[model samples]
Target: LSNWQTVDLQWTPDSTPTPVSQLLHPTRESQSEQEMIARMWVLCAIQMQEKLKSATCTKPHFEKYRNWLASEYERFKQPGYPQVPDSGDLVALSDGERLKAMNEMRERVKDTYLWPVIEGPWRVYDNVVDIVEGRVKLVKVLLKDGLLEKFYDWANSLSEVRPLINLMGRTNPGLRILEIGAGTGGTTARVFEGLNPDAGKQLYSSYVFTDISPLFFDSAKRRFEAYDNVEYRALDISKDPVEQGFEAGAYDVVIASNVLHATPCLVETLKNVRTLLQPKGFLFNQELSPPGKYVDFMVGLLPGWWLGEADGRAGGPCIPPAEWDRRLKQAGFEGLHAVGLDSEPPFYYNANMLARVA
Candidate 1:
């Protein structure tokens, strides 16, 4: 896939684009705002079901299925091929070549045959329902039971945390720390361990746990409560800084996990986090990677499947990695770092970044 051009044109002029969008919608009314709302409800149900079915499947099998579906969809769909930005090629293909390519494409209906018969639709349906209802708890539980931990382990395994620690450890000992989207508490736990192995006795002054869902806060709080220095707060960091009850520049280290995409305003959140960090303090984030067509499909489905509604609004606001790099630079931070976490099947991209307040 790396050798192939990543051009983003709808399709080569000669190839036929699959009608998946059309099949999903089937009519112009599907484009209406009202129809989109109705579709959101349906999408939520689909997502809920998908979450449940995925729970029973093995990680390898689930990943294999997702990959197979993506590969198959790529084969039959002309427009989705070459997902990268245009590389300036203008040559046209012959009709014979185009026809042959179409023949080699993957068929969606055929590929779906590999999924569990009684449960496949339920999985997809339930996921959509979860999204429409804004039930992040149920969705996250599904992720926890399914593949979230594996993804974290995969990310950490590939990452060299020493650099992040070396930069962060220089701060005063027993400082206050806050972490957003602290999935499974792996990164935060590691930070505590790295700072002092006897973390339960002498870590930070306070550790505030934050996330979009109360459920996440509750569960994470339980897991980390045994430690002496951790607490949880259920709040979306993008909304407002004052709500978290901290004065500007109050924390020594602020960390967010794979959460940039979920935030409504990337710049605002970064600014707020910066304001909360002391001079020369550190900010860390593990981010989701940029989207390919298949990746986009997976992510796009999340709003409807897991949350049961699209909180991103009409157009949605998804800031890519390059834009993030540019924005962090503009936000008065130096030594920004973005780390890409490993992708396990189903989810093919994961990454992260770090930056320091100047």
Candidate 2:
């Protein structure tokens, strides 16, 4: 069904800017609140990208490029940096005007992060290994000593606060759980906490933390090694789980966070996801649907960002929430619903999709 049609970049937004606090659990309907939330996120994105611009740059850093980002990163560590502006000041503008202003702000910082890719002689698509592996090496230092923790926590809030956590390892048999592409362990840490028996929660009978890359497996094993109930492996959801030595209809819940979209084919990937799930098992995914300006430009440079011609999407890398529903159903999912509907997309850039096998 993928006709290789391309989806265009949606530079415009329906959601308005609001405070980070409100943005985390977006339930706002008021235009004033929405505008404020979007604004804060943009600022956070700018700061975070500037930090990334400095941290990830290799291939002879321009003294000026390096200096500005370094100083900016340092500046944020100090007392007064830009935070959300007054709503009174922000709300003065109309929705269209506000969106244009936010886009303008996003554009201003684009150069900061794009410099590494832009300045390099190699085209970004062709520089895959260098671009990704180089940045991967800087993982520890790029922490900015957690200067960007707030931004990260904001982006990952849904992982910790997810609705599925309550059901994990809590059922009578301690439901079996699988996290595909458990890269970076962002969602894993939070899910594990909720499942920890020390919290007086039931001991999960089993948990398999998996990723296609061996790199993540080693680190995850070290970090979660104490959890005897858990196991780690590499799982490429793009392929059939059965052939990959996984049992079909065996898992109670499957967590596919921020990974499915990378597939060359989503519906095919969804079918593979279903192959590992019980007939009625839940598939919970956390993604920044229709990736934001920061995500679109930064992470978008990688070859994976372009996806494949056969992928269901018209052209762009990301899919909107509504289209996700349509595709999930096409892939044999039923009882599909947004996990935290109140705080779902268009409300914020990120969203959680919980779909069940028919």
Candidate 3:
């Protein structure tokens, strides 16, 4: 099958953006909030089960999550803690029983502190105003935690990006590179720094930092203003790349971190990505896998308004490595391999995939 015919799926945008309050207070009186939470928990449990079967669960992040869960349970059980209708019985039940109890707890805690403290902060914030104003602590923590740098280190240690870097160095002096979803240009900045170690060296003839919207252009422009080789553009992968003026077989390297999953149609998106590359160009992507239960629960609470699929099945967060490999191959990419970190927690959170045109 041709790349374009691989899937019939297309993204559907939400007509109205989700309100901030809905995320902070995710209980829909019309639809049972308890039911929603219970379903989410079940999904998390299933993913955990699959992960445990294949890999040991001794990661530091896992331990942190365990401690957090235990602490939260204890906090909610304190004497005179007003939200507990069932007197904390929800804490000591089997997964199945806990589902029922969670519904009960949800009903009792609808108007209480339980939802705000635990769930509110995890919601995703899309508003540039809210994100820049620091109204959301989660986004700030994620951005400041050096996740991009960590991924870069892991990839370099594994020789994942090094070979690619060396190859670029040997090629024509002025390589053409494109970075999609350059949010705040943090990842792109680190990547370029890694590519060119010297303080005053330009590795690429043209480096384009792009995103679906130009909301982040000003910051990215200011960040890379010193480098005349850098340019900013708005490109949405969900649509036709050529139509957006992305010439076919033009870019030498295309890199995206934590961005590809946002595409509504992975097949079409990859096709578009391939069209943007030279016949033998490289594509490097870093994505988050299924996180631990506690992290999963919190991330699930984030407003997935940008998710392309309504059923929460679109390729954003928590996609398995195997699934990514399969999809990349289907999208006309070849020579695909994944590099994962072997840290104390087993790098279960994020991984990098490198591929090239067939």
Candidate 4:
């Protein structure tokens, strides 16, 4: 749990003089190899110092320390960037030999750069949305201790449940909603609050909160006891079929915020979502967008350390909005408009999108 702290911005100085891009950019391509290496170290030093400052120091101290880095760069012999070995470069080796080489290189990279430590179990940089949203503390807790399922549950609850409740107050309300991964009752509570409001008394009629986790159903049940129109169940709609119990064009909205990526069958999931929606109904979702190459490298290696024991596992899934639009159309949904949310983060590059059934 403490490991997540390293990734949180709490320890970072709110003010740093140099922007990361300026600090990290190559000083001069025409410079000597040694000079280039030195320049790289300067950038690395700034990054390391910023990380330290972010953790538990003040801006004045961070500035003083940053100044020290310039002096130290002049005195110290900078370390060279390791040569990345070619993958499958074996000229005359058995499968075992090739595998061993690959594993060895992987280990070397992990060791030298402390990529594991740099990326670590406690880093918020892994969750760009959280970072962009400035929900550092929440990221630290949710991503800690293999509690990622909880994180997903909580994120969906906050993002959609609250917004859905608010939307419930609008005209032609009681919007039928289908949700996937309704872990815990965070979202349900909010949805109910929306429904039970003075405005809500005339609003919502029914909601289908589905999850593979039965535990989530129980939790939602407890919270939604007074909500007469709400319903709860555990469902793997992609595996089984929404049409088994409900006809096509039955729902006003199909919502599966962060859960779609975890579905083994993505295409099938979209088909199922469409299968359950009323004509012109909406399909709403939010997910992590893939980061740049270097950021991705850090994210892939560090979540274990930054998020430690939490739902910090790498290789889950991140779907780009463009791909989502293509798939939504292929599934026969029209008017697919995927807009990135300003409210969420790692804003440097992530997105959230919405679409509607034709």
Each prediction's TM-score versus the true structure: 0.54, 0.60, 0.55, 0.49
TM-score of 4: 0.49
Model 4: per-residue Cα lDDT over 1-358, one tens digit each: 1111111111124422222222111222212322222222223432343343344322242343334444443333333322212111222345455345434433543533222322232243234233323445433444454354433332333233343334433433657777777665544454556556573273656788888767666646766666676677677766645434655676776666556766655667788888787765767665555332222222322222222122223333565666667677877766354353322222222244556676
Off by over 4 Å in 3: 1-167, 170-172, 293-316, 342-347
Could you give candidate 1's per-residue lDDT for residues 44-71 as a string of tens digits?
2223333434444333433433443444
Give the lDDT of residue 315 in candidate 1. Answer: 32
lDDT by residue for model 3 (225-265), tens: 76767888999986878899888898988888767876666
| Cα RMSD of predicted structure 3 | 16.9
* Model 2: per-residue Cα lDDT over 326-357, one tens digit each: 78888988635434432434445555556668
Residue 329 displacement (Å), model 3: 1.3
**Per-candidate RMSD vs. true structure?**
16.7, 13.1, 16.9, 18.9
Candidate 2: segments with Cα more than 4 A from true spot: 1-154, 158-163, 197-200, 341-347
| Model 1 score (lDDT) | 0.47
Select the stronger candidate by lDDT from 3 and 4: 3
Give the candidates in order of TM-score, highest first.
2, 3, 1, 4
**CA lDDT, every model vs. true structure:** 0.47, 0.55, 0.52, 0.46
Tell me the RMSD of model 2 versus the true structure. Answer: 13.1
Native-referenced Cα lDDT, model 3: 0.52
Per model, state how many residue pairs clash.
53, 17, 4, 32
